[PDB]
Amino acid sequence: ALNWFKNEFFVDEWNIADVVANSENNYFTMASERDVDGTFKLIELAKASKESLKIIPLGSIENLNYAQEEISKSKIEGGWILLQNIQMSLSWVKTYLHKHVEEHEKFKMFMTCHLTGDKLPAPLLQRTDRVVYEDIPGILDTVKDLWGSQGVWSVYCTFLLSWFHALITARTRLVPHGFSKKYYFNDCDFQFASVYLENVLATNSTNNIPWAQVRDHIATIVYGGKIDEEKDLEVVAKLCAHVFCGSDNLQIVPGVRIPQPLLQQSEEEERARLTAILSNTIEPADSLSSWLQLPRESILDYERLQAKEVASSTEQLLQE
Amino acid sequence: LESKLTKLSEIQVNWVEVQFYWLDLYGILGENLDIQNFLPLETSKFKSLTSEYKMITTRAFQKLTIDSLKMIKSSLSTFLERQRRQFPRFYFLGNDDLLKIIGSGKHHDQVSKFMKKMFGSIESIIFFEDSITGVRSVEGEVLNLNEKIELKDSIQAQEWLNILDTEIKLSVFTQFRDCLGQLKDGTDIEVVVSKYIFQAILLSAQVMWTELVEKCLQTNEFSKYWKEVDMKIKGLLDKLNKSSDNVKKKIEALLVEYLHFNNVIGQLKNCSTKEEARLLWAKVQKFYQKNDTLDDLNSVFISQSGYLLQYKFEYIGIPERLIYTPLLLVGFATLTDSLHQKYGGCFFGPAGTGKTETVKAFGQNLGRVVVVFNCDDSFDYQVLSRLLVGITQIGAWGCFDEFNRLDEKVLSAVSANIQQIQNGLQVGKSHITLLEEETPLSPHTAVFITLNPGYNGRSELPENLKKSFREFSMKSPQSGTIAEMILQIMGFEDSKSLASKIVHFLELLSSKCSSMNHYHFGLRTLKGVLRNCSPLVSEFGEGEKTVVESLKRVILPSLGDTDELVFKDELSKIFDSAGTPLNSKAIVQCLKDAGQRSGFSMSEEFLKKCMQFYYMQKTQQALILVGKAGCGKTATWKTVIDAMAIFDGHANVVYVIDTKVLTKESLYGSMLKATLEWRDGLFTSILRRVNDDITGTFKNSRIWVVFDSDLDPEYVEAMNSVLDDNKILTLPNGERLPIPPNFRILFETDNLDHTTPATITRCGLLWFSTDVCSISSKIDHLLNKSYEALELDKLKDLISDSFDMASLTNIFTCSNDLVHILGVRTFNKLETAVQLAVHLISSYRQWFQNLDDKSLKDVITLLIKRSLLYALAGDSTGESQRAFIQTINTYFDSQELSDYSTIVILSFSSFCSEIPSVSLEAHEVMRPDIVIPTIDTIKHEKIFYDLLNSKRGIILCGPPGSGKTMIMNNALRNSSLYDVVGINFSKDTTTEHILSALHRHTNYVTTLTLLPKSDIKNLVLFCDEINLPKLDKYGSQNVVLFLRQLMEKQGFWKTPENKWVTIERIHIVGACNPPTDPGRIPMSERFTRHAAILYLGYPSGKSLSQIYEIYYKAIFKLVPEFRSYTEPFARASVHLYNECKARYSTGLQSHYLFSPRELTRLVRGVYTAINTGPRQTLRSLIRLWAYEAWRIFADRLVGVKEKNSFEQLLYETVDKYLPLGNISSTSLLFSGLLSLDFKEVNKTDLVNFIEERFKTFCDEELEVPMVIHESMVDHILRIDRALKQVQGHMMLIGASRTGKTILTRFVAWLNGLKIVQPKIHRHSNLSDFDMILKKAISDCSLKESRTCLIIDESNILETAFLERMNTLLANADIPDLFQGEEYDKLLNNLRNKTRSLGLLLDTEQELYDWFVGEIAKNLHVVFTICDPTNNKSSAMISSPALFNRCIINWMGDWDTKTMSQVANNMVDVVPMEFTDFIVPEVNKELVFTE
Amino acid sequence: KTVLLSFLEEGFVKRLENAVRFGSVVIIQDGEFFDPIISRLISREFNHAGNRVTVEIGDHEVDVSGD
């Protein structure tokens, strides 16, 4: 019901690439909460646009002087530059950065701050475009994003790994029943799991895929490192056993079935077939419950609380 | 000639240091060729230093040189940087060790001393005829090099160090290859274990194991290999008993490895299918070997989970091998996964779970020594990046233990460097840039972090740093497996059941005990109980008695009262029986002998605690002593060290370091950013002196370091690498100080609320449940100590017989029912009683030779009763004091001690005959030292002087204005034995202020010793408002702990030079308010233990009437016609003060605090108005007193309701006591501007005069169009009255633009003062305020210029400005301003001014007193506060010195009358009446004007 | 004739003194970081001696041009 307004009246949305490619300002500020970062998004975006980032974290006087010198140099000849955790240098931001922004054509500067941190100065913040980086909440949208970011078995295992990452990132945002604490699995875990899958498929040319090894390594080493409690490890192992069971038929979603690749295909047609079988999937309204294999009570309570909060806030908003 | 010997020793130490520095300088530049041409200026400086050294040597054979050497040490810093660039491992050495290692041109023996700091696993080098043939590990194991290294005199250090480093790898690879060939030949390992080194046998055994497991995995059987491994393990177990110590350690570690092998084989055998067997085999580490690698050192690679790592072939010696738990294997797997992509491995979880040891075990399996670093708050960006650039070049694995300890800014700053090293390792870059320098990057390097999340006072890692690390949880280790394999290796007959019983017992002890903070029973205490059961096998044997005895000796001292019973019940019900206890005859005899030597008493509890401490210190290096304040911890460890020194014959040195009195930079050390050099702290200097052994006196003598303060995590936790198994100290500059086995650390505190479980499990814990000493034993020991500090035998016998214990215990029980300020237990009060009684007996002993036995007994009993009263009930109210003296009189034929009984010169008398007549004149009221004596005043004087003559600390406490400084100064003014220095404390006071206030009163003489400047008089250190110094975030006070250290230990530690001083003739007297007063904080009992506490209540109403009628008689000696009116004025003033204190309380406003200070100020104001005035009638005198009461009492009132209430109170008081027109504030106008005398004046004439004066001031100084009004006339009259006084200061509080600074400037111009407004602005520091105050003080004193200082509220940038102003107003000068060279220049200028004026003043004290008098006379300060709600203004108002000196004049907002007057007077000059107006019909209350 | 200063730029006092001597119109940005050296300019206190008017700013006195 909440997404009905967005999907009915509004026909477009902008990601970070769209807002950085359609803004006249040379300065951008991205805010993110604790235990989430968006630096890799900037790295991939700069790689796509064929430009070099100068990552300059703040917090020390030497880094402040280096940032001043690099800002002057990049205003002289060009090039991008990025500032990490600018709230650690509040005095520098208040004086030098404010004076510089207040006072080239291929020069853009990105600043990353924390939403729960100290208050940034209003005159600086209003003079720069603002982006908020959050993980995409939809499951199928997350699968599509992870697939579009990217023998045939490597591609198929990448597809299954993207599905597993989307499932676990969807499950990790349900506090009392999905897990025990607030675990957040960033892109580094996905990259490490993909490297492990490539290494396993490279060292095993017999095509007898050791799915037990992949299951244990993913559920214990890669995605199980941050897991602290025993029951969270058990549920991660259950999810990895459901996804990486290694069978010809694999119904990870009650409406999506992935046939295993055959021994006569190439990577291009395999990627096309997997994209085609991903495109036909229609996400139901109960995809937060049926896809994650959870009882309806917890999902219903969470959705009801979210709906009550958003409706009360917009009712308080509309009256004035 | 003790001073001569000390001077000779100091000169010899300085000469030895200078000789070592010159030897290093000659080694680096003076001897070697082709090295002076690098820096020609430094070469010339070295030549000049050589000439100076040669001249000094010739003069000595037949200071300044050291200073010149230190000056040219800066020019050698970049040379040392290049030298460290030459050999990467020099980054682990300090500057002095680098100088020693370069200067060893031909001796080559200095290398082995620092090689342990360099490599980390080698303690010495075997030398044979100018060649290297062997290398010796830390554990004593010897490795013989493959080829003998030739040595020449011309070659310098780093070339042969590099070839030795390569030769170590070649030798260990050669031994590994030979051992592997021998094992492949088919021989057993029992003959190979006695030939090659341990790393070679471990690696060959692992390679053989993985090869045979692969061969068996090709098939599907495991029984035969399991049986063979079992026979090998049993053979090693049988061989362990018949081998030497080194072979025992080697066989133990091989047993660890083979037990892991058998565990893996057993896991594989019980497996069902082939796929699960392949899974279990892929999960565990495998040690392969390339058969096509031509390179020798890269022929061994380690495979796990499909990834590969390269063996480094570094010598590791004999490490304590970790038991291969499944958690350890999963940790190895995730470390391999992190290291495959050149990331950084990370571990998080609760403390004591095996993270740093896991990293070290992984490094040892990879055959390299993991360098461990203990992160600290002092690690800024430069230090951390220098450590990173030092571990890049070496290639060793850096483990940053406790990574959360870093500041969050540094965590964000080092993220760029960590990403850079990761990218350089990934892309195979050769050179990376850090600190704007390009450095080589060894491809073997890595970084590890082991943080401890979830504890307070720790930062949280930012995401950009956490994304560069791979973290793994380590919440729960496996205690059962560790205990089982360790007990199997030790040779215990029963291993599995015993380990299960130990783990079950530990779990039951954790679950079934009181859940306080310091009960942690994790892995660390299991390792401790196993290590304590290790050496008990020689006396108890392998079995169950050994483990129950070790469990007792490890856990029991840390248990409480009921937890001990629970522990005993559990131990009796889970284990079969308790073995035969230790005889312990010699040690208990030594404890008894030491106690008899020190005068203590052996009770059951004290002896039990001593035995427990000795047994738990026999194997645990660090001990924490906890319990109640004054329980007996210090006595316990002192007597057990004395007994242990007697028993073992080893001399013992103790360093008692107070942790919280020193900052962290003073304790561990600080780096000077202006030169990037390292300055040693205190603990680091002590450890370096112990390690270096210049004189070799610490070879066989133990060292104890006692941290006698609270356990601050930010202080103690920085020694985490010291306390644990690492036993190393990691300095920020890179120095690694090893901890010797005999070096032990003690902790002494009372509360463990703020401590962390990380630093609790590291140290052994000893809890003091109850007091170790009985009460009567405490009297006995105190009496014996006081006697030793001093016929005598008869006096001692009768005094000891006087203390009847049966009455004493009931007296102590009845003492508990009274109310006590600064609540201290009666057990801690006996010091004052015993010391006071002994001092009185020793003082009156000179008259004890001329009286009978009964009179002697009666006098001594009365003195003991007086001492007991003033000790036990000396800090209670008057009624409680009367009740206690009645009780002690009841509980003791003996002479009765009344409420005012005393002894004069030897007859018992009272204070009624000791009250003298006072000839108080008129002019003597202004003198602050004039005190009118009463019974209470003279009694307090006698008891305070009595306590101070007994060499004890005194804490005078009472409500403000009780008279604490009054009684003290009046008692010490008539005595020529002590001097009083005035120190006032604020919310921000440091030890440096106390030391500065004593530098101009005391002398540093080396014999260090802080003797007073005078030689016949002691010095009294008066500290005022001890409550005011605030707590930190961890509930501790710097100043209070400094005072405790100065009282008990009789000294302190000098911060910059790190030498212990000893205080000799300084007594500490403290003044404070009760803790129930707002703004005050409680103080720890560890400070109030050492000092006597006295309650000083307010004088009674009739008493105050008596003193103030004496004052009024003194005043009215001027005017004799009103001599009969002194008593009504005293009664009226006392009633007025009582009514003001009762009605206007603190509940209405913050600054409604009244005191007898107000009455004294009223009397002094009445005196000034009488003296500077004409002949007064009765009505004029009444109006004068009413005006003085208005300007003293009602100035601080804020509300118009309060003003009207005070006016009607004044009317009521005048009508009641003094049978006169309006006496309102607007109707009383007393001023001396209109005449030559302080007479009452009218309104219009005063307004006209002030109009003319304001016009002249505007035309003379600056133009401001301000309109006179009646309220401003009253305000300017009271400001002029306040500034006319001697030592008169103001605090004008009111809204902005009411007119405060312009009014003060106009008053100062009227009185001829000089306005000095500080020009404090933005980006201004404390230094500019120092210069402003110093210039103002100099212009006030030297130039005799009357200076008025206006300090606006916006001119206080920091709280230190407020502290400086508080010091200025409390004393008369600033101790911090005039010190050293500035002090000498000030004294020279003061001497020149005194000679110019013509006074014959020559002594320092007289000149300083004249300076103080001049600055008090000629300086007045007027404050200005706009908003009294702000925190800075609230602290300014609530400050002790500012409130007790300034006359608070509340300007307030403009009332409607002032607004109407100024509006009429400023719009009367414009034509407003040009139109018709009809008068409206409005109410009287609605209209504000006429 | 206008001139732009700011409290966050070094050399503020010298430029302000030169502008006061010349008589130009001065605008200062970033007023939330007010500098108390100009407190005498804010208070508009004047010292008159003949046809000249002097104002103390910081350490040394300067003359107000009148415009």
Ligand SMILES: Nc1ncnc2c1ncn2[C@@H]1O[C@H](COP(=O)(O)OP(=O)(O)OP(=O)(O)O)[C@@H](O)[C@H]1O
């Ligand atoms: N066995 C004993 N026999 C006699 N007197 C004892 C004994 N044990 C302790 N005392 C007395 O107890 C006093 C206080 O003990 P101690 O000096 O050890 O205090 P502490 O532990 O340092 O105190 P705090 O932690 O409060 O600073 C000692 O001065 C000593 O006179």
Ligand SMILES: Nc1ncnc2c1ncn2[C@@H]1O[C@H](COP(=O)(O)OP(=O)(O)O)[C@@H](O)[C@H]1O
């Ligand atoms: N097999 C093992 N695994 C883990 N810890 C062990 C093992 N054997 C002994 N220990 C003990 O556990 C302790 C581990 O300390 P650790 O948790 O690394 O400290 P920190 O938490 O400060 O890094 C060591 O004192 C060590 O003696």
Ligand SMILES: Nc1ncnc2c1ncn2[C@@H]1O[C@H](COP(=O)(O)OP(=O)(O)O)[C@@H](O)[C@H]1O
């Ligand atoms: N003979 C006396 N009897 C009682 N009170 C007196 C006598 N002489 C002076 N006083 C009062 O004692 C006060 C001293 O108080 P003080 O010790 O300065 O307070 P605090 O202890 O808060 O510093 C003086 O203000 C004075 O009014």
Ligand SMILES: Nc1ncnc2c1ncn2[C@@H]1O[C@H](COP(=O)(O)OP(=O)(O)O)[C@@H](O)[C@H]1O
């Ligand atoms: N009676 C008055 N008539 C005219 N102006 C007044 C009067 N009283 C105060 N002022 C104004 O108040 C200002 C002085 O206030 P000042 O003492 O500098 O405030 P602050 O004490 O907050 O520094 C002057 O500029 C003046 O214009």
Ligand SMILES: [Mg+2]
């Ligand atoms: Mg640790």
